[PDB]
Structures are given as C-alpha cells and as structure tokens.
C-alpha cells in the first residue's frame, strides 16, 4: 500500500531544476526523476515552469512540486491504488489533472508518480523493473532483446557555431555481437572522433554539447559525416558501425520552407528549400554514407513533406516532434505513412501507460520504436529498463560521455549481465527488434 508520495526539486544535466518523486510502500522508497527537453515540440504535454525571472532564470518547478505534494499526494494515498496496476495508476493521475495536455498539474508533476509507481510495483512482484515493464506491455521475454545504442557523438544545428543545419549525428554499432561490445565500440569511435576533432578544429572543439557529443564549427553535413567515417575507421570498426541522424528540421522551418543556413541572420531566402528539395539532399547523403536512420527529416506538422519522402526513403524514418509520443498523432502518421519509427519520450505524453500504448500501436503498425532520453537528463535510469521491457532493439540516450548518459548505458550492461543467454542483441535487426 502506498503510504506516502513526495516531490522535491533536483537539478538536471544542464543545471536546471526538475521534478523528482518518491513513492513509499511496505517495500521501501522508490524514486523517479523527470527529464526535460530543450526545443520541445508544440504538441508535447505541458512541462510546468514557474516563470519567476528572479529564480532559476524562470525555470523553477516549485509549482509542479507543489502540485505533487498538495494535490496528487493526498488524493493518491487516500485512493489506496494498486501500484502493480499501472493503467489504474495512470487513469487516476490523468483524471486528477483533467486536461488534454496535462496543463493543470503539469506533465512533470504527473510523470514522476507514474514512473515511481512502476518501480514500487516491480518490488512488490519481486522482479527487476525491466521484467515488470515487459509484463505491463505484454512483451515477449523469451528471450529478452538488448537495444542497439544510437550515440549522438557530433552536434550541429543550434548546437554548434558552424553553418551545419542538421542537429544530431549518431553512430550505431549494429555490427556488434552484444550490447557490451556495441558500447565498447561506441566509446572507441567516440574517443577517436574527439581526438580527431581537437586536432582539426582545436582544443575548444573538444568541449561537449548537452548530450556529450563534440560540437566543432562545421559548415556542411558532408564535412560532419566524413569526420564520423574517419573516426570509425581510425577506431578500427569500419563495417560494424552505422549512422543515425536527427535533423530537428522544425528548427529551420520558416514560411513553409527549409533554411539550411538558419543560423545566419542574413540567410539567402532564395536558397530556402521546399519539402521535395530537402528530401533530395537527404537521398544524396544516404547514398554516400552508411545512414540507417533519419529522425525528424521534416517539420512537426508538415505531413506532406514526410509522406513524399517516405515513398522512396528506404531506411528507418523516426518521428519525434511530429508524434510527441502521442497515440493520436501516431495514428495520423501511420495513416499518412509519414514514417516507420517512433522516438519514445515518456515525458512528451506524461504517463508510463500512455507511453506503452504509443509503443504498442507503433509495433502493431509495423513501426520500430527508439526509446529516447531528453537533452536535459538526470541520474535516473528508467529508460534503460524501459527499452529492454519494450523489446524495441534500439535506444537513443546520448554519446558515451556525461553520466546522465552513461547511467543508462551502464544500467543496460547490468541488465545484459543479469539476463545472460536469456537475452539477444538486436544488432542489424534493430528496426524490428520487437519481432526477433
């Protein structure tokens, strides 16, 4: 029985406050922390910030925390809910808020309780979190499937001072035999990339972005990709490492056009591209580099652009801001055949149950699911257990630098170790890891 529900302010990996929730039962105290994105999609569930410019640059979460302590906590405890029944837990939370976007209590108030409940439930059942998550999602556990880690080793877009528009350049060791090996390989490619970057761009370029990747002043995608390929070869893993991209195109989408030089105040408007034109650029890159995944190639509401490109894409097209882990928007993407992979961000929707449903609907539509961190992470490792529980075969949780990233990767190592021969590595079958 849930005897107590408490919330407090803690700091995320960017030094901004976020919500941490603790749920107490006869099994002990279970803690979950809420992550936070930077450029959140317009359709994401509301992250409640205080807006007090005199405190935390106006990013305090005192209101969200109060909503947990003064509203959710009392009601939840008196309700005597069964933490094992995650749907009941979340229906209770969703009803308490009573808004379509969780704007009343705040998604960052609700999620912490939703996640903590699942941890308390795993303990009551006497099974590791990932196993409980497999039960909640009715996922096959014979055997379990470890995910291919997509490591964001190089930053561009608003995450770099160059002209490079594309935001994330990830590496994916799909050729690895195990997750442990994939992680080692990723670390080696990352370190080789870092040394090469420092040598060609200077020590400063060695500094890392929010997610741990380097962010040198790069001008074109070709330059970035060539650097990554050089790192893969220098590390001695050519043939075992593929590339993933997150264009975050919504950030350079203006007047229904795409400005690949948006970081330039005097960008030549006559060089802005239409949906089909930008798509052609992606095809050129896809033909020259081992790119096996492209996220948010087009704006979050430019459905036509997505559908057009998908017709001849040929590789995994991941939807992030387009779907915001929302089943309703996912249904639209499936009907319009806009993509074939969901970037799963639990805090974009607000509850574990809704996130699981988003994943199930995706898998049912033949889509893949890449569980994802947020640019603003914490020491919380829930998504490590979640990606395993969901048997997706693919996760995006940072470069192999900064512990808000390594914490998840390390947790995956422990899960792998614990499962032994009862688990397999998605490898090249990452797209349909759930079907392995």
Ligand X SMILES: O=C(O)[C@@H](CO)OP(=O)(O)O
Report if residue 343 touches ligand X, rule: CB under 6 A: yes
Between 248 and 386, CB nearer to ligand X: 248
Site string for its own copies, 143-162 (x = CB under 8 A): ----------------xxx-
CA–CA separation, 175 and 168 (whole Å) = 21
φ, ψ at 175 (rounded to 5°): -85, -5
Interactions with ligand X, residue window 346-375 (CB under 6 A): 372-375
Q: Which of 100, 102, 127, 86 is nearest to 352 (CA)?
A: 86
Q: Which is nearer to its own copies, 231 or 318 (CB)?
A: 231
Does residue 344 belong to the site contacting ligand X (CB under 6 A)? no
- 312, HSE (Cβ side, Cα atoms, 13 Å): 11
CA 251, distance to chain mean position in Å, is 17
Residues linked to residue 171 through DSSP beta bridges, in sequence order? 151, 243
Nearer to Mg ion, 246 or 354 (CB): 246
Q: Which residue is nearest to Mg ion (CB)?
A: 320
Instruction: Please name every residue paired with 20 in a beta bridge, in sequence order, or none if there are none.
Output: 8, 33
Dist. CA 429–CA 92, nearest whole Å: 37
Window of 2-10, 88-96, 137-145, 305-313 that interacts with its own copies by CB under 8 A: 2-10
Q: Which of residues 16-55 bind its own copies (CB under 8 A)?
A: 16-17, 20, 54-55
Residue 387 CA to residue 393 CA, distance in Å, equals 7
Residue 375's binding partner out of its own copies, Mg ion, ligand X, none, with CB under 5 to 8 Å set by partner kind: ligand X
> ∠ at Cα 19 (17, 25), nearest 5°?
150
- Which residues form the catalytic set? 211, 345
Which tokens in the block code for residue 305? 């652009």
Instruction: Check if the beta carbon of residue 76 is closer than 8 Å to that of residue 92.
Output: yes
In the stretch 378-397, what mask flags binding to ligand X with x, by CB under 6 A? ------------------x-
**Which residues are at the interface with ligand X (CB under 6 A)?**
37-40, 152, 168, 211, 246, 248, 320, 343, 372-375, 396
**Which residues are at the interface with its own copies (CB under 8 A)?**
8-17, 20, 54-57, 159-161, 183-184, 187-188, 190-191, 202-205, 207-209, 212, 214-217, 236, 377-379, 381, 399-404, 406-407, 409-410, 413-414, 417
């Amino acid at each position: 029985a849930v005897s107590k529900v408490y919330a407090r302010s803690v700091y995320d990996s960017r030094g901004n406050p976020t919500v941490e929730v603790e749920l107490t039962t006869e099994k002990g105290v279970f803690r979950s922390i809420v992550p936070s994105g930077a450029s959140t999609g317009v359709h994401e569930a509301l992250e409640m910030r205080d807006g007090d410019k005199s405190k935390w640059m106006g990013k305090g979460v005192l209101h969200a925390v109060k909503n947990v302590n003064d509203v959710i906590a009392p009601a939840f405890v008196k309700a005597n809910i069964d933490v094992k029944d995650q749907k009941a837990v979340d229906d209770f939370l969703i009803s308490l808020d009573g808004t379509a976007n969780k704007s009343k209590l705040g998604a960052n108030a609700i999620l912490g309780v939703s996640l903590a409940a699942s941890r308390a439930a795993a303990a009551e059942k006497n099974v590791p979190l990932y196993k409980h998550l497999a039960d909640l999602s009715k996922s096959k556990t014979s055997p379990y499937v470890l995910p291919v880690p997509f490591l964001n080793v190089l930053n561009g877009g608003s995450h770099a001072g160059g002209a490079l528009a594309l935001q994330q350049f990830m590496i994916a060791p799909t050729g690895a035999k195990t997750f442990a090996e994939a992680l080692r390989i990723g670390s080696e490619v990352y370190h080789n990339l870092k040394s090469l970057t420092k040598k060609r761009y200077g020590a400063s370029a060695g500094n890392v972005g929010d997610e741990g990747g380097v962010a040198p002043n790069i001008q074109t995608a070709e330059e970035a990709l060539d650097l990554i390929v050089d790192a893969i070869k220098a590390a001695g893993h050519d043939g075992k490492v593929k590339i993933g991209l997150d264009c975050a195109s919504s950030e350079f989408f203006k007047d229904g056009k795409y400005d690949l030089d948006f970081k330039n105040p005097n960008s030549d408007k006559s060089k802005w591209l239409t949906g089909p034109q930008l798509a052609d650029l992606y095809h050129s890159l896809m033909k020259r580099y081992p790119i096996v995944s492209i996220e948010d190639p087009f704006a979050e509401d430019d459905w036509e652009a997505w559908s057009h490109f998908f017709k001849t894409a040929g590789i995994q097209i991941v939807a992030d801001d387009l779907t915001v882990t929302n089943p309703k928007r996912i249904a639209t993407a499936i009907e319009k055949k806009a993509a074939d992979a969901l970037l799963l961000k639990v805090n974009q929707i607000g509850t574990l149950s809704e996130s699981i449903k988003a994943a199930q609907d995706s898998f049912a539509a033949g889509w893949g699911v890449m569980v994802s961190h947020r640019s603003g992470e914490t020491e919380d490792t829930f998504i490590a257990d979640l990606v395993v529980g969901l048997r997706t075969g693919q996760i995006k949780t940072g470069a192999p630098a900064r512990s808000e990233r390594l914490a998840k990767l390390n947790q995956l190592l422990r899960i792998e170790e614990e499962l032994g021969d009862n688990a397999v590595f998605a490898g090249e079958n990452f797209h349909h890891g759930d079907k392995l």
